[PDB]
Design a protein around this ligand. Sequence first.
Ligand SMILES: N[C@@H](CC(=O)O)C(=O)O
Ligand SMILES: N[C@@H](CC(=O)O)C(=O)O
Ligand SMILES: N[C@@H](CC(=O)O)C(=O)O
Ligand SMILES: N[C@@H](CC(=O)O)C(=O)O
Lengths: 326, 326, 326, 326
Amino acid sequence: LPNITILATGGTIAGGGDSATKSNYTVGKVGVENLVNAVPQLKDIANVKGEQVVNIGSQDMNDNVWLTLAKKINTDCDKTDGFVITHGTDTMEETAYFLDLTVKCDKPVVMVGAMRPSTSMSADGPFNLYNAVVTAADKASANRGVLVVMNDTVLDGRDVTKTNTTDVATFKSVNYGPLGYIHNGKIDYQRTPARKHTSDTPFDVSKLNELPKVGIVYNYANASDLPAKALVDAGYDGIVSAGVGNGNLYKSVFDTLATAAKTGTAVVRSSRVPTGATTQDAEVDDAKYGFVASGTLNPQKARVLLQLALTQTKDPQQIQQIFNQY
Amino acid sequence: LPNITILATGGTIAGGGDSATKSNYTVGKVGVENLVNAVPQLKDIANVKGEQVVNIGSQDMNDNVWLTLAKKINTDCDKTDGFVITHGTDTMEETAYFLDLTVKCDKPVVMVGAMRPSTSMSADGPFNLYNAVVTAADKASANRGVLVVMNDTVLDGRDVTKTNTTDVATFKSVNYGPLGYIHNGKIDYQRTPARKHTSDTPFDVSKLNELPKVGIVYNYANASDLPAKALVDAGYDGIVSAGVGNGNLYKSVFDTLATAAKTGTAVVRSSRVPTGATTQDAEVDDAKYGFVASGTLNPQKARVLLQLALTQTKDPQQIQQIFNQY
Amino acid sequence: LPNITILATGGTIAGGGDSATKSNYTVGKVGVENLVNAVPQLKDIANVKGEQVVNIGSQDMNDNVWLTLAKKINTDCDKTDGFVITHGTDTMEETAYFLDLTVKCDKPVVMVGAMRPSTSMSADGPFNLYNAVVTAADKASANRGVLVVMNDTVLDGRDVTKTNTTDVATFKSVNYGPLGYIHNGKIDYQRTPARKHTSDTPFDVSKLNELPKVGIVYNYANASDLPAKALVDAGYDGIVSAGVGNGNLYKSVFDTLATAAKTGTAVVRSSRVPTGATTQDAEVDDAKYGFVASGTLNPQKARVLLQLALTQTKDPQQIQQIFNQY
Amino acid sequence: LPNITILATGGTIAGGGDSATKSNYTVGKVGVENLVNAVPQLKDIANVKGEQVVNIGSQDMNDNVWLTLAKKINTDCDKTDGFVITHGTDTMEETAYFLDLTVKCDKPVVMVGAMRPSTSMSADGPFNLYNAVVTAADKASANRGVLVVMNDTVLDGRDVTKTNTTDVATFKSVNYGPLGYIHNGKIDYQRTPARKHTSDTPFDVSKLNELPKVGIVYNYANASDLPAKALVDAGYDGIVSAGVGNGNLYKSVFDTLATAAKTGTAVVRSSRVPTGATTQDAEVDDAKYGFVASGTLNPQKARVLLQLALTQTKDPQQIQQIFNQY
Ligand SMILES: N[C@@H](CC(=O)O)C(=O)O
Ligand SMILES: N[C@@H](CC(=O)O)C(=O)O
Ligand SMILES: N[C@@H](CC(=O)O)C(=O)O
Ligand SMILES: N[C@@H](CC(=O)O)C(=O)O
């Protein structure tokens, strides 16, 4: 068998309910150990070693945890065959993409959570954990980047997102589809990311204790400029716009961000629209204004890349090239 | 043939670039009487009369355009057999729901735009416009609320949303599906909305000059409390949270919005997740904090309803009731 | 609490296996009183009585089970407050549509199965059944036709189909979407079917021992006419063509079915394509050949309706109208 | 500018009706000279050579057209820089997979069609054609397999399928998603098919003038054995079974097929279910009865692979192997 480490961070997968009938519950009661001691079948597929890193709802996920997850993984690379990260579902797609850009252990890194509490009828957690370990142990999983494994499906960390608020089938790669499917403890990979990841990225967080400050502002009919102005006033390093349609902006927000972009703030145009690319060559002349278009990166995911871009450069043209590559 | 009034507001639908192949276009350029003439086949299904209300990209849509439109429709109600509104696609989903809650005319009101400019190859707007007049002229279209017609589909104002940044098929009713499909100038209707709309709402905008101020804040890992603080300091009537997962909030945003709610700001919890409801009895004790769960309403649609609700009440209790009925 | 009757027919929901992480299983094996006993939370929402009808895999479902089911619900209607039918997943969409047109009880009638064996890890059966009883118990579920409840979603008998071979989220209403979602054992209904069902149909099976023979043939490139020829020669009362695109047929198949239409056989054009309507007034002149367009009814569903159609009439115009109403 | 050969085979893209608004049309009557001419913007991206092969609707596609096409592409290979094939949409997903297996040429082959006839009001053919030539001319499109280019999307020949009967966005790669998206005449490829293709397959058809005979039977409730029986009694080389759920079979059809398989007729189990794999080690024991499992190949595509498999072999288990690799 291969050697698999489970790094826990909390989530519903660790969370406990009032009873079997209710999804009013608390997030993150239990640790790595008895997520295992509730799925004895793991003994048949892996040598499983579990360690607690934090115990939180992913809605409170932050840069500190990302830094410590990355450094951990980059350090214990060669004491294990692969990693599984138990995590809340809410911000799983952010963590996954951050680790997809910062981990250099080319070994399998898989993330997993649960949409149902552990104490509920037909709790997804167990079989989800089974299948993340499978993906982690299978050696075909390596060099594909950081993974999310949910509902018998293996998804790439860059394209994966939470598409539904309550459904066990929420996680999908909405633009380019999944990498593989899991039936009977086996995977059929028919796809791999072309965007560079893990050890082909230039990002180094090994010495960092904080990350550049990047916020997100939302666009809509009659949008206030007040949220954009508070991020500039507080000297934010970057701002991602969750634009309307193809990264378009309400004029008031446009004006403020146009100003911010010529005054030491990096501006990435993303979209509130859940699928498809925020392109160049449309309604907004990015060159004139010094903005960067995010492509298929949603706001949250754009934020992740922008922070990392900003650990290297503050020039928009080079941030655009970075957005064209990872 | 029935009399159809086209109210034009702008959009790509009235767009046009410097080329048929190139994507670079300007919106709100062509006049309504031109739009009509590029679709003479209109001549055989209605007596079309065009009126220009504004000529803008819908990224710049605002409360005044909404109020103008609703007042125009309610006033001219019984001098026409139905209405079409030509509109950009970026915030069509917001206008549509606005009019769904404020039009009293029980004749059909159909909104329509185009993902590709008029000058473009295989332009979508012509047939979109035709189908939208077919919808508006159909007597079965009446009593279904305000409709959006795009890509041979009839969709309800409440559930319709833009799912894709560039695809002609972007508009979908993502939670409950379309009302009907259009083939050969005819509709087979299999669904009507069950929530109260149009003439059954208490919202009366006929004497109203402004709407209560509602802003939207976004949640993500390490989210700043500054955007939300800026809205509270400006004395906002309501705030809509674009939450993570089932309407959850980053801890520092939670704190600012809790505080706002005790000082008589409406706070609605919605979700950045494109599908599914933000429910009560999840992780957040709505009753304690005086919050409202938005249901299947996404943030930009929650704002629409929250502004109108605020014209009747500021009791979160009654606002929740409205969010459960409209 | 309401008296709910469970009518069991088989399926994986009732079909065990050897180990929890091996996807082998035998189907239709456990009895109704075991299923009920395995879910004690039932006792909090309903007084549940089980009756075994059959115990097969749904792949082996047949006209005789369908007639027993309908006659049973029609006799026992007034002894209970709602029915649930445990049933295999493979042809649940066929049976649901059959009962949708023949049950005369307007009390809730809910079907349910399981995509995973009841012994496997994170088995859907127990929660699936609870939600089905929740729906059968909810009075709001009356007058909506026959329902399929799977994955916290209530779907109408007519539009519902299996979209995926293994996924627990397989059942969707792919043309018009769900009626309602379930959360914390409560249902928000936003939709009901417009097409007529249950007691608003003329089908009366109370004294039928058999149904008209209807068979389905597939179309593809270079398709054999042979299968259509074999059904003709055994004297089939009707044939449904799974066509290509919009109900189109390989020439050889067309001409056989055309001959047969002249010799009193009912011919319905449907489509191998999973979503969308087989329409009239495209490439096939149905009037000329005595053919019927199925609309959004896929081949196996189109079959159900043609069988029941044939218990009233043989005229192609009347069958078309039936196809347009039910 | 690159040299692009267009091989026209017909389709709605070469179809036409009496009126822009009326849906009745006839297929494959517009010549390639007139198609090309209807897109003058072609000159700007290629030097295009129009060659008619046949002018049929793809409902009548057969083996002889497939062979004329393969041969013509391998022969004409070194005289051109890429291939575009105008076709009908109804079987495009069959032809695409056949050509994907038999073209030995490494240059790009791109299939294109239209869902609306060229006379239709917002005809998709002219822009679709342009995009086809873009994909064909982009040098990064090389080495990906045979492509289908519809609705601004570049889809691979193995996974692409028609999901809807009338919608312009009907072509999707429903299990593993698309290869790239086209904006503004350029393509960002993020994926490539893993399974083998074009130059890297065993199959040569340079000299074959006939392909083995392979038919498809459909499973459903109370399904008839007569179609299956008809096909063995004609001594068909192979039978594909569109099964219910995970390739399950009605009892009487199971028998007639068990027979066929271990008396020298090959039998692939596929599924009527539009997505997901017909897997081994579920309900049926494939090795015992001598059945091949089709994986994520649907019936029509499994037939393409099985036809071609039988040029090389007849043992079940080497056909199972071709079904794990191609
Ligand atoms: N709030 C939870 C939700 C979940 O895990 O399902 C989390 O993200 O930690
Ligand atoms: N910016 C445009 C985009 C479109 O119409 O497609 C609008 O006004 O929404
Ligand atoms: N073959 C089974 C599958 C299931 O029940 O899920 C049946 O249809 O009975
Ligand atoms: N029946 C036509 C449909 C189309 O081309 O859109 C064909 O496949 O030839």
